[PDB]
Amino acid sequence: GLTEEQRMMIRELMDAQMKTFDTTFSHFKNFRLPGVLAAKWSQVRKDLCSLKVSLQLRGEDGSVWNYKPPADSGGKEIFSLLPHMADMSTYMFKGIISFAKVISYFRDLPIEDQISLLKGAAFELCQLRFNTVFNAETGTWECGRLSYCLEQQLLLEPMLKFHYMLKKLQLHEEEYVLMQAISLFSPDRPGVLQHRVVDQLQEQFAITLKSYIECNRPQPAHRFLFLKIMAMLTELRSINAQHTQRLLRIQDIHPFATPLMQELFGITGS
Amino acid sequence: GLTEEQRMMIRELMDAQMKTFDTTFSHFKNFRLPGVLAAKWSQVRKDLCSLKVSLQLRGEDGSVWNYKPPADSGGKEIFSLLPHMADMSTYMFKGIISFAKVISYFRDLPIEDQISLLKGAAFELCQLRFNTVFNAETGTWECGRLSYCLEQQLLLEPMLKFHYMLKKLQLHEEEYVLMQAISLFSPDRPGVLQHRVVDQLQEQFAITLKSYIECNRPQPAHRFLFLKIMAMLTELRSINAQHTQRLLRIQDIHPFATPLMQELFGITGS
Numbered sequence: 024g025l026t027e028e029q030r031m032m033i034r035e036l037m038d039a040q041m042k043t044f045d046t047t048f049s050h051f052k053n054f055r056l057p058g059v060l061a062a063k064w065s066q067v068r069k070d071l072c073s074l075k076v077s078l079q080l081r082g083e084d085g086s087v088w089n090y091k092p093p094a095d096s097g098g099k100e101i102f103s104l105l106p107h108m109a110d111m112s113t114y115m116f117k118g119i120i121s122f123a124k125v126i127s128y129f130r131d132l133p134i135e136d137q138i139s140l141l142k143g144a145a146f147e148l149c150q151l152r153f154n155t156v157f158n159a160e161t162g163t164w165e166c167g168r169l170s171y172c173l174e175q176q177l178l179l180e181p182m183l184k185f186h187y188m189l190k191k192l193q194l195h196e197e198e199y200v201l202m203q204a205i206s207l208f209s210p211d212r213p214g215v216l217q218h219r220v221v222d223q224l225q226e227q228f229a230i231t232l233k234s235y236i237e238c239n240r241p242q243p244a245h246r247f248l249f250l251k252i253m254a255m256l257t258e259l260r261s262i263n264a265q266h267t268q269r270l271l272r273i274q275d276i277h278p279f280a281t282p283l284m285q286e287l288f289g290i291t292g293s
Numbered sequence: 294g295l296t297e298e299q300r301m302m303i304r305e306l307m308d309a310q311m312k313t314f315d316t317t318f319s320h321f322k323n324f325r326l327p328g329v330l331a332a333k334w335s336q337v338r339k340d341l342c343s344l345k346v347s348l349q350l351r352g353e354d355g356s357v358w359n360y361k362p363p364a365d366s367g368g369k370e371i372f373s374l375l376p377h378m379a380d381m382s383t384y385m386f387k388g389i390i391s392f393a394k395v396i397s398y399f400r401d402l403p404i405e406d407q408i409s410l411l412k413g414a415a416f417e418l419c420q421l422r423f424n425t426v427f428n429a430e431t432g433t434w435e436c437g438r439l440s441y442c443l444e445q446q447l448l449l450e451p452m453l454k455f456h457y458m459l460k461k462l463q464l465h466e467e468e469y470v471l472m473q474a475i476s477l478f479s480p481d482r483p484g485v486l487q488h489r490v491v492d493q494l495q496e497q498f499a500i501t502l503k504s505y506i507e508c509n510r511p512q513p514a515h516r517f518l519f520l521k522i523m524a525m526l527t528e529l530r531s532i533n534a535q536h537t538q539r540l541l542r543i544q545d546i547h548p549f550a551t552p553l554m555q556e557l558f559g560i561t562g563s
């Protein structure tokens with residue numbers, strides 16, 4: 024059974040998730056949309072083609088807008104969805120930042136450790152929240168009135184393979200929010216000072232997740248599930264590192280990062 | 294055979310059509326689009342539902358936007374496409390006005406007869422030009438990078454039955470432009486003073502059309518084609534009258550007419 028203080032730990036995480044995760048994306052608004060009607064470039068081109076999606080906008084009246092992205096023809100058209108994706112990423116980053124500020128274990132860390140942990144894990148927590156709205160049967164992220172549909176060679180892309188593999192473990196809401204906590208409290212992010220405090224905090228979150236699975240998942244299909252989840256978190260950290268490199272390469276030739284993204288990625292504006 | 298001065302008549306009409314009809318709609322731009330995300334009303338509701346279309350925007354890069362209109366739920370949502378349609382109608386009206394100003398038979402009329410003829414026939418010439426880009430097999434008006442697809446009970450709507458019936462006569466470009474001339478030079482529009490001059494001008498255009506068909510269409514399928522075209526022009530005049538009533542009813546509860554539309558429909562702004 025879960026100890027008393029582990030139940031309180033899950034409850035506060037679930038509470039923060041309920042307060043800061045707008046599952047309907049109802050307040051995602053005023054976002055940009057695609058307009059109507061050398062070796063660096065070769066690599067920026069490869070960075071974007073494997074993450075191509077179409078976009079659908081369902082209106083409150085019942086109207087539907089659908090956007091199909093263009094094929095790569097050797098021009099700026101591969102950047103048509105970057106302003107919108109920056110707006111969605113920024114909205115998601117804001118929810119992740121609010122999620123961390125509610126958690127007591129996070130407020131009690133020094134503020135300049137809070138910034139270091141958020142800078143290192145904001146992308147990972149965003150991907151974990153996006154997995155809960157991912158439809159693996161249709162390959163679409165269903166974000167309330169917005170839908171991002173992927174245009175099985177796509178599973179070669181580690182980000183897409185991550186979302187398909189994670190969705191198939193069929194995790195509970197409690198397991199997702201504990202994954203967010205373990206990723207957020209990674210002691211070994213750049214600039215973390217209280218690595219000792221963050222380490223034992225992460226260990227308690229992992230122990231709680233381990234005990235949660237052992238108490239609520241007896242089926243043979245969930246054997247080694249905790250170890251499967253931990254391996255997924257290691258893969259997500261790797262995806263976070265390669266995705267940061269992609270963003271910085273695209274930012275080099277075609278700026279698109281919002282001020283909040285610039286802050287999280289260390290861009291000073293000079 | 295066509296007389297010498299009839300050949301010159303067709304040539305000037307064809308010349309004006311070539312100069313003023315942008316068949317690719319390349320200069321139709323900066324138009325509005327639907328936003329993203331009592332007994333008068335009952336009749337304004339019936340006026341709009343039978344003319345419902347979806348909208349597709351093909352970009353130069355290869356991207357495609359598609360708009361599906363909402364169903365009627367008893368609200369303002371039936372007016373979502375009115376600003377765009379007013380922009381398309383205004384662009385088409387401008388081409389029709391430029392078409393008339395090139396024709397010598399039109400410039401030589403007094404200017405306040407030119408305004409009366411344009412006020413009475415601008416809608417009809419617009420519909421005739423739209424028929425040349427109508428695809429009866431798909432029910433879509435293919436306007437270059439824009440496509441307006443109709444959402445056979447629709448043939449009950451006289452405007453849609455007109456476009457299907459006219460397209461099936463498979464008229465030449467010369468026959469279309471002569472239809473435009475006969476409609477433009479209708480002597481019996483409100484405010485026409487030189488009804489005698491306009492009458493014999495229209496008669497010459499009809500005689501030229503009659504002679505054109507007799508000289509270039511010997512096939513049994515084109516028997517009575519001139520009489521079929523003349524009957525279509527009478528039907529178009531009737532459609533013009535009922536459509537003016539629809540527009541004025543919609544303008545009463547939901548203003549949408551551009552300044553050019555207001556001028557053509559006699560709205561003073563007071």
Ligand SMILES: C=C[C@](C)(O)CC[C@@H]1[C@@]2(C)CCCC(C)(C)[C@@H]2CC[C@@]1(C)O
Pocket residue numbers: 074075076105108109111112153164171182270
């Ligand atoms: C900020 C990152 C990028 C490269 O500019 C866009 C990544 C984007 C992203 C993960 C961005 C966040 C929203 C959502 C719908 C989950 C998409 C799925 C499609 C993908 C992978 O292209």
Ligand SMILES: C=C[C@](C)(O)CC[C@@H]1[C@@]2(C)CCCC(C)(C)[C@@H]2CC[C@@]1(C)O
Pocket residue numbers: 344345346375378379381382423434441452540
């Ligand atoms: C100005 C008139 C209206 C009522 O506001 C719109 C009419 C509109 C119209 C004839 C307007 C001109 C362009 C095009 C694509 C031919 C459409 C076809 C669909 C239809 C019939 O709804």
